[PDB]
């Protein structure tokens, strides 16, 4: 979604430093408001201490800052943050791999639903659309980016993802629960009807198509599960309390105290707490990692591109089962027909990558 | 890719020490430039303090160094680095196991696509090439090492991985998305056509070949996913900010202060911060682990050898379905035909490894 | 169960702060009683020290508080807590994914059990009910929320999940063990009988239905395993001993000592230990995470909604195999019949999400 994969392909001098200059989906963009509020509260307190407090009040503030500073300890924050963010990242990738792709069903429907006639074409196209509909229905239930594009079931119809008859049949089935599973049932019935009409040879080929359907259903279920079962609220609150406890301590504890009073640890007054602000970006930015990935189907820069996926799948799906049904290129003899040990060429820049075969660690390299 | 597996086979005296003398894919090669910049910035600051600053300025620098040194804390860096590098290492191995291997399809196509005639040969060879093409297409999309070898679809054709007719059919199919999935559809269609021509006996055998194809498609999808879905940028920036914050503190904090002033902790002046430089190799090298494996398909020393894999797969693939179709050695009686409990020999060096059968922990060893 | 997924969809200013104002399934609701007892014991001790102890006794208390405070170390608690809570969270999600869903069997039974006559209808409905019964039986064995709804096998019958004849057959089978597996056997027998009556065409389709049944059985087994095999008691006691040891130390160690005596670290008297109470919410709330998820089938706010699942599954199950058996909508040509590269519309708010196809990191974006 914010892909920088090609920038970090090699481990060169500025592989990671270069990324500090990027704004899209960056730490600056996510921390902006929070950082400013921190900056303000800090320098506000700083001026109150330098310009308002009396000599006697300043002595109390200095004693209060020493108290607060002794409680700004990251080690407990690092512990709970690391674990929580690890949990979020785990679910984040699991949710991605749970986005259903048509390609596996697409391959079977394209080759095993017979007929080069309009009905065979309508049959194959309708089967794929039942798959894409099972997906679009669940995606608009879990993704705010998709829902805002299909806010009502009418949008789904007008977008060409569901026919008005299907919508009628959809409404006809009375159920109080999410009907995303309906197209998945239609598919199995239509696949069986297709087999009875002789469009699907065996039951082995039919069950094979039914299996890939069931797999797609399990994908939609996983998406439903992660949307329904949030990370327990108590856990989320714990990590924000811990993080905020730290920044609360820093607000006062990290104040630059009087250099003249010579407090151990506060010998220099820089006015601006460089390292405390660097700690804020670290921990507030670290919390923002979880903050952004806790729901990867939202509208964040790094949230999944669910609407593009829908478009790509629609185009590719139909194309593979229609224009490509039993449509192959001209079979030719391959360029290595009479060559048992082909030696495919290398460009000038890639010849260093033509390596001898790795036989095993145990063998002597001679 | 940089395999030292045989060197670390045994846990001897210098099993790991020996590896500190290796340059290829080493910590020295990856840290070289960064270390020099650190070295320079350090000793530059060191000379400014020893030779330029006035007695009064030196006192401020010493107070500034005590401030910076109090913020060079590795514990928070260790937390975020360990977690981040673990995530990178996790994806690193997942991407490797996502590199498709022909061997499973290779075994089925070689034995279940009938015919010892030129067509049967062309059929089997074309089926394998559709698999290898599905792979090469995705590999050149995710690997810079491969792309620089196949920068254009013409390179793929001229290299013998795609026929010009296939390229024509390829172009004929209008789609704005990556067509790496095309050969995977052709395969299923060609496998079905082969079955209708009587070259594949049952549908059980056909579905079995279609399944191994779908698995290969899922492999290509995983590669696409890891290339598309980068580790969230904010997370990457967080760990570089944390690491750099530490080295910023060390640049000044780890300066050798005046021994005469007798600062607690700074009683000895060695001019060269041995342990601080050793800490740099540790953390900068630890960050380089993630820096190198975050994209294992690049051109790093330890990045995957994707071009060799392509070559090996091409050679082995065709060879197994052509020269090896229904081609077996002469069936003989095995050397242990009349021996129910064979006792295979051992070399002189390996006799210590002939052990009695492990029956279970519960049994008395007598 | 306490779903806030939509609130945390985007990483905005108050994404996580907002959740601190929520009561249901919150840290406040789970810690309430414990916190009050801590508060009381603390201020109780505080008053005894300020108002009861003599000048000589106060000096001992101050020496005792310095001793206790030196043992309030979070680092060892963070270690064991983080690990333990991670184990609980791991099992927590594994148990969720082990809750059986009818949808996969539902799809096969609806399309592969032939007959539009009352028997075909009774056959399909009875097959699904044998599945839902296998589930309801195990759920009421592991979930207190479900058991309190089906305390006796009569409740199961009167609720319409088991017929009185089935209950008679149930009792007839003499076994001292949990009979949740019985309906799962009936299903396989009824599925075979259905095939012999010609209601299930092939064995390929029959084995396919038997496989999805076995999968559901494995789901029930996982639920049984997690209920039977608790997290080892010694481990649970260890983490509570560690946590309580910390709060025991804090009860005395974190007392506000005499400011006049000028103890290093105790220069300011605030009467209320703000940061110690913030540490209590952190660790006591962190322990409550494990405390709540160690049995996700209980009656906690964030415990699974097992009774709703039963209701939803009952409704959807029967509906898909009865009203939807071979019942499809009118096949129409799709809106993109003559459009090879469809461009589904976007709402005004979602047009920014229409992206160009991601081809791969290696390709030049031009």
């Amino acid at each position, epitope marked *: 979604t914010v892909t920088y994969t090609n920038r970090v392909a090699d481990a060169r001098l500025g592989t990671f430093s270069q990324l500090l200059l990027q704004w899209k989906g960056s730490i600056y963009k996510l921390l902006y408001s929070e950082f400013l509020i921190f900056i303000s509260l800090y320098f506000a307190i700083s001026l109150v201490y330098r310009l308002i407090l009396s000599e006697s009040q300043r002595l109390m503030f200095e004693k209060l800052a020493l108290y607060c500073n002794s409680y700004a300890e990251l080690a407990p924050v690092s512990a709970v943050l690391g674990a929580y963010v690890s949990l979020v990242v785990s679910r984040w990738w699991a949710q991605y791999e749970s986005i259903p792709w048509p390609d596996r069903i697409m391959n079977l429907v394209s080759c095993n639903v017979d007929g080069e006639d309009e009905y065979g074409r309508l049959l194959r196209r309708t089967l794929m659309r039942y798959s894409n509909l099972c997906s679009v229905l669940i995606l608009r239930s879990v993704s705010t980016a998709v829902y805002k594009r299909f806010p009502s079931m009418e949008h789904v119809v007008r977008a060409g993802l569901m026919t008005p008859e299907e919508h009628k049949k959809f409404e006809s089935l009375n159920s109080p629960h999410n009907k995303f599973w309906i197209p998945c049932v239609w598919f199995s019935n239509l696949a069986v009807k297709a087999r009875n009409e002789g469009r699907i040879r065996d039951s082995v080929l039919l069950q094979g198509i039914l299996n890939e359907l069931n797999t797609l259903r399990s994908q939609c279920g996983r998406l439903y599960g992660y949307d329904w079962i949030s990370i327990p609220l108590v856990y989320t609150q714990v990590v924000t309390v811990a993080v905020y406890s730290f920044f609360l301590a820093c607000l006062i504890g990290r104040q630059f105290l009087d250099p003249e009073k010579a407090y151990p640890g506060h010998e220099l007054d820089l006015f601006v707490p460089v390292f405390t602000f660097l700690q804020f970006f670290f921990y507030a930015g670290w919390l923002k990692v979880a903050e952004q990935l806790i729901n990867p189907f939202g509208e964040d820069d790094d949230d999944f591109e669910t609407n593009w996926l829908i478009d790509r799948n629609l185009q590719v799906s139909l194309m593979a089962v229609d224009e490509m049904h039993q449509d192959l290129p001209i079979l030719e003899k391959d360029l290595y027909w009479n060559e048992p040990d082909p*030696q495919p*060429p*290398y*460009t*000038a*820049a890639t010849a260093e990558y033509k390596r001898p075969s790795f036989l095993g660690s145990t063998f002597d390299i001679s | 890719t940089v395999t030292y597996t045989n060197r670390v086979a045994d846990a001897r005296l210098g099993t790991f020490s020996q590896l500190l003398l290796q340059w290829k894919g080493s910590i020295y090669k990856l840290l070289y430039s960064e270390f020099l910049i650190f070295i320079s910035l350090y000793f530059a600051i060191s000379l400014v303090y020893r030779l330029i600053l006035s007695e009064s300025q030196r006192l401020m620098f010493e107070k500034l160094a005590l401030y910076c040194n109090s913020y060079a804390e590795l514990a928070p860096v260790s937390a975020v680095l360990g977690a981040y590098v673990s995530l990178v290492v996790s994806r690193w191995w997942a991407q490797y196991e996502s590199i498709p291997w022909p061997d499973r399809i290779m075994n089925l196509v070689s034995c279940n696509v009938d015919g010892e005639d030129e067509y049967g040969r062309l059929l089997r060879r074309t089926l394998m090439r559709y698999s290898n093409l599905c792979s090469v297409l995705i590999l050149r999309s995710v690997s810079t090492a491969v792309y620089k070898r196949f920068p*254009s679809m013409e*390179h793929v054709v001229r290299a013998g991985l795609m026929t010009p007719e296939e390229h024509k059919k390829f172009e004929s199919l209008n789609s704005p998305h990556n067509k790496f999935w095309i050969p995977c559809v052709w395969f299923s269609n060609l496998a079905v056509k082969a079955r209708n021509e009587g070259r594949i006996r049952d549908s059980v055998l056909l579905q079995g070949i279609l399944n191994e194809l779908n698995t290969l498609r899922s492999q290509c999808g995983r590669l696409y996913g890891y290339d598309w879905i980068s580790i969230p940028l904010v997370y990457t920036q967080v760990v570089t900010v944390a690491v750099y914050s530490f080295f910023l503190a060390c640049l000044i904090g780890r300066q050798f202060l005046d021994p005469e002033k007798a600062y607690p902790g700074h009683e000895l002046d060695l001019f060269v911060p041995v342990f601080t430089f050793l800490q740099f190799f540790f953390y900068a090298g630890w960050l380089k682990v993630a820096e190198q494996l975050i994209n294992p398909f690049g051109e790093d020393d330890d990045d995957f050898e994707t071009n060799w894999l392509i070559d090996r797969n091409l050679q082995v693939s065709l060879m197994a379905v052509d020269e090896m179709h229904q081609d077996l050695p002469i069936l003989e009686k095995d050397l242990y035909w009349n021996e129910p409990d064979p006792q295979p020999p051992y070399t002189a060096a390996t006799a210590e490894y002939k052990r009695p059968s492990f029956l279970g922990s519960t049994f008395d060893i007598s | 169960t306490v779903t806030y997924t939509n609130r945390v969809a985007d990483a905005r200013l108050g994404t996580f702060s907002q959740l601190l104002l929520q009561w249901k399934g919150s840290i406040y609701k789970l810690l309430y009683s414990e916190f009050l007892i801590f508060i009381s014991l603390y201020f109780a001790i505080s008053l005894v020290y300020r108002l009861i102890l003599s000048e000589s006794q106060r000096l001992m208390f101050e020496k005792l508080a310095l001793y206790c405070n030196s043992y309030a170390e979070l680092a060892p608690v963070s270690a064991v807590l983080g690990a333990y809570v991670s184990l609980v969270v791991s099992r927590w999600w594994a148990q969720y994914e082990s809750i059986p869903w009818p949808d996969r069997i539902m799809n096969l039974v609806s399309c592969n059990v032939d007959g539009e006559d009352e028997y075909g209808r009774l056959l399909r409905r009875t097959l699904m009910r044998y599945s839902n019964l296998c589930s309801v039986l195990i759920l009421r064995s592991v979930s207190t929320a479900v058991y309190k709804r089906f305390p006796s096998m009569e409740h199961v019958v009167r609720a319409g999940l088991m017929t009185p004849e089935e209950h008679k057959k149930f009792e007839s089978l003499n076994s001292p063990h949990n009979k949740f597996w019985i309906p799962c056997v009936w299903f396989s027998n009824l599925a075979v009988k259905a095939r012999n009556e010609g209601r299930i065409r092939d064995s390929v389709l029959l084995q396919g239905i038997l496989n999805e049944l076995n999968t559901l059985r494995s789901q029930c087994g996982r639920l049984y395993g997690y209920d039977w095999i608790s997290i080892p008691l010694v481990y649970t006691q260890v983490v509570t001993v560690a946590v309580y040891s910390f709060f025991l130390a804090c009860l005395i160690g974190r007392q506000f000592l005499d400011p006049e005596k000028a103890y290093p670290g105790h220069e300011l008297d605030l009467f209320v230990p703000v940061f110690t109470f913030l540490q209590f919410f952190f660790y006591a709330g962190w322990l409550k995470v494990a405390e709540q998820l160690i049995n996700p089938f209980g009656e906690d706010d964030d415990d699974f909604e097992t009774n709703w699942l039963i209701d939803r599954n009952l409704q959807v199950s029967l509906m898909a195999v009865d009203e939807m058996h071979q019942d499809l909508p009118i096949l129409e040509k799709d809106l993109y019949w003559n459009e090879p590269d469809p461009q589904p519309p976007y709402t005004a708010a979602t047009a920014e999400y229409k992206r160009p196809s991601f081809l791969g990191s290696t390709f*030049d974006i*031009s």
Partner: antibody
Amino acid sequence: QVQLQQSGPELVRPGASVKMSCKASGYTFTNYWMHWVKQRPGQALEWIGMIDPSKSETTLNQKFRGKATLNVDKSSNTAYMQLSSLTSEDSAVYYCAREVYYFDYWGQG
Amino acid sequence: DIQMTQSPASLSASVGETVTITCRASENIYSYLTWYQQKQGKSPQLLVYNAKTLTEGVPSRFSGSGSGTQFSLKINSLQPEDFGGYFCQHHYGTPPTFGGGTKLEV
């Protein structure tokens, strides 16, 4: 049709610098590496270097390290080569060729 | 670097004849060799690539062979057009050095 149109002939005084062009057309500029060859009468063709149009990665010949410079303009589909500290020996015919495991299209020179 | 040694420096033959130019590699270059034809004043043109494969326009009378370190171009049944310059180039690595050349005169 693939066509590599280079700049016109040049005349400079020793020590100066020159920058010749090569405009490609009829194929995707960024998908083929561009090479530069030096042709002197009586000597064999010398390989100066190559350039990756996409990322402007240059790979020169050690023999031309300080003499030649490569860069491209993806927008105008043209490649450039700059020769510095020109001497009498830097006088020759300079080609730009497209690579596809071979040099299948050269410029006029 | 890989050294390309071409021979003969110049061959003289008349129409109808069949000549054979030879390029020898300093080290193994597998099948990575190309043959170019260059007529005085014009820019070179690709004849054979990948050691054996003829390019588009090349007539059947041209054929290449060899592998490893020994390659050869063979022009059977000469024509008037076939008179001019001929050189080889290896394509195994960087820099892709060229051959000395061969002047084919009448």
